[PDB]
Symmetry: C3
Subunit: 331 residues, 3 copies
């Protein structure tokens, strides 16, 4: 890309580009068009969620600039993706109140703190923060809803002690399950949004698009093998963590080969199992696990990589697309 | 201070001074008179809680000396403050049994282990342990009360699944809320104790006394903005975490300026929100969050500081009063 | 041992030796005969649990070799012991289904990931992973049982909010409590299995055998002092965490003397108290704490050791039997 295009830059267009890469990075895709198309998929499903994704991405990005995060970290969208999710999560789980937008901005800003926390903390081992800033901030802003009534929880939020119908697996289970598994990465209960999302990843990386598809499928059929009722599976609730596992493990943080593929398959399966685990863990307070399943399991596999000679890890500060990763190895 | 006064020292008066600085350090005040006045505020509210604060401070300090902690860490009260709290927490939440004093000594001694754990662990990033030793030890000694009946929980301890009256905000809400917010840092449901506490901090640092006041107010009105019932707010239950946030962030661990002030305001607000969050999280087992809200949120902001160019952190091994901090910067 | 015996080695006998040391290491005993005798104790109680211990040890060991863990870590059984436990835990808590063996192999394989994670993570402070890989993997594979019905929980698994009969202490309380405390380290509700286990440790280390006995007793009487009902105490449910505390602290990770003995006694008592704590913490979801009590408390004491001049820690990469440890100090 012509170095002279830098004469054309202005803080507003540069901020706008940081924001769209921010959104791309929700699925590890450092690409403006990918992020632009993620926004398109969300806006396709809901205008309200779309505006809130944008505001959350904008809130977190701006906060990072206000505090003076290193320019390259901001330019790569690493202070945007947790803000995208922080923005969608709130109106997904809670009913609208006028304060909703203020609260989204707050949740966005808070993710930026936690991203910096975790880059400082996890950086000693070269391990990425993933979506932990989004999960930890949103939990902190959501758990207290029963005591702090500004917002009112939706019907998805229902405290209960866990206990042990099953439904019927059909072709629909698989087609809906697949693409909603991708869509549910950003709380998008929408087959077409999921398709758009896969296309969006394809633009930046073909291998990462395939692993998104594989992850969703592995999560889905893991849950079926494990005798989940059909309804959650069809809704892609067992795909989205495994989607993220697939993309992270499938050539981004490890060099793609047969061994690292098997390793990736490990994360993906356990991501789906951890989804049932964390959902149960938080059920007494009625709260969603979000992407905690993907975070915990992928952190375990990431931390473990340097101990396994047969598993070629990519150095995190270098880690680009699976295609780029292979091309720098062969060099 | 005349170096010859060292000829006058004796292990008992030196231990006594370690203990009073220990108590001062509950609110980051490395000052014997501050600690002496904290004791005075507690004894003003309750003789039983006062003796137990002293015994807990004494138990933790002595254990540190028995194990051979570095003299300067002990001399600065860093092995006392968690013991002060460990001592008060037990008779605050549980009914009296003769064993109570033994258990306080045990809780005090345990905090010293955990302080050393966390200084070793968190020390790699220059992050302070705060009151995590007190919280983790007390949780470990309290959670098991339903299975181990030596002690009997008070009526504040009542397992329930969370669920969604509101009361009436008055002038009393604000005056009681303010000073009980300070008092509740040490479980002191007492307006005058809170005043005494603010005076005690003022003796060592004017800026830290103001931030104690600001923290309590920010916590209070955050909870009101968030539609908390009035009763918890009036009782200062939403101030005390934010008091600690305010003091830590307001010039002690960051150099006081407009940007670090805004940063501090961030911790304080989120400290109050995290108070609702952690209270809900532990409600199925009926247990108090203690200062976990302040610990988690302040840890996040502390870990994040080195990533933010616009936020001037003080090196922790140097960090004194906000006044001293400014005076060494200008040098 | 004659260096020429190396000519006789074959991958299958070497794997077999890795597996038996793996089992020995459940109680820190790097000894093939110790592990062989642990297997004997289990098979004495239950053939089904014995086969499953072996399969879990085999699954974790093989996975480590497949991924290329450093040979000496594997040769020392450090990638076996969490697999032993991962294997027993599943049929102890859940009813049989044909998939049980597949799931055990999965749990075994997962422990190996987490062991590597934690050796990388905790290695920066020279702190051992202990049985955290077993606990974290098994929790992840167990918690989700209410949502993923392949397996069906046994009657030990019963979600309830905690609440506040007492039974009668007799000689039986003490004899059964003692040896089941040892036996319950590996989920063996069997006095003779516990005896066998103590003998097995004695083969490798007399001091570690005594600390196993002391730990079990300290845990037992701590729980009685704390007014536990008699039934859990008799069943050794308050010994097994303290057994592990005793062995770890009694000369393995610290050089055995009077001060480190008192230190060890600290871990052991708090291990029993933490057992009530974590049992309550997980009761809303009906889940066992496993050895989390021992892990948390022993981690605290381990991390704290380098801060205490009066407490002589052994460097972890050197740490052998208490007897060997003393013999290298005197050199
Ligand atoms: Au944009
Ligand atoms: Au734009
Ligand atoms: Au743009
Ligand atoms: Au990336
Ligand atoms: Au764009
Ligand atoms: Au919106
Ligand atoms: Au919205
Ligand atoms: Au399937
Ligand atoms: Au399948
Ligand atoms: Au004193
Ligand atoms: Au004194
Ligand atoms: Au004194
Ligand atoms: Au200080
Ligand atoms: Au004093
Ligand atoms: Au007392
Ligand atoms: Au007392
Ligand atoms: Au207000
Ligand atoms: Au206000
Ligand atoms: Au063997
Ligand atoms: Au063998
Ligand atoms: Au063998
Ligand atoms: Au060992
Ligand atoms: Au053997
Ligand atoms: Au079996
Ligand atoms: Au089995
Ligand atoms: Au006893
Ligand atoms: Au006893």
């Amino acid at each position: 890309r012509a170095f002279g295009e830098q004469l054309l830059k202005n803080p507003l267009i540069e901020f706008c580009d940081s924001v769209c890469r921010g959104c791309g990075q929700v699925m590890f895709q450092n690409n403006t068009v990918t992020g632009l198309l993620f926004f398109a998929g969300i806006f396709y499903n809901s205008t309200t969620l779309g505006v809130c994704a944008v505001l959350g991405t904008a809130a977190s990005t701006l906060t990072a600039q206000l505090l003076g995060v290193d320019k390259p970290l901001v330019r790569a969208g690493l202070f945007g993706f947790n803000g995208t999710l922080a923005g969608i999560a709130l109106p997904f789980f809670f009913n609208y109140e006028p304060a909703m937008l203020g609260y989204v901005a707050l949740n966005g800003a808070f993710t930026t703190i936690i991203m910096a926390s975790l880059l400082n903390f996890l950086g000693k081992w070269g391990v990425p923060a993933l979506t932990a800033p989004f999960v930890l901030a949103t939990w902190l802003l959501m758990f207290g809803v029963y005591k702090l009534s500004l917002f009112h929880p939706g019907a998805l939020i229902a405290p209960a002690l866990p206990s042990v119908d099953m439904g019927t697996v059909t072709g629909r289970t698989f087609m809906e399950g697949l693409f909603k598994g991708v869509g549910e990465v950003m709380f998008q209960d929408n087959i077409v949004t999921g398709v758009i999302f896969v296309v969006a990843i394809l633009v930046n990386s073909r291998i990462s698009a395939l692993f998104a598809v594989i992850g969703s499928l592995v999560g889905l059929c893991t849950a079926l093998i494990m005798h989940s009722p059909e309804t959650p599976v069809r809704l892609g609730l067992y795909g989205f963590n495994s989607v993220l596992c697939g993309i992270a493990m499938g050539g981004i943080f490890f060099y793609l080969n047969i061994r690292t593929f098997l390793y990736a398959l490990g994360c993906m399966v356990l991501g789906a199992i951890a989804t049932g685990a964390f959902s149960v863990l938080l059920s007494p307070i009625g709260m969603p696990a979000l992407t905690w399943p993907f975070i915990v399991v992928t952190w375990l596999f990431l931390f473990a990589g340097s101990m396994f000679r047969n598993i070629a890890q990519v150095p995190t500060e270098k880690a680009g697309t699976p295609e780029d990763n292979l091309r720098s190895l062969a060099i």
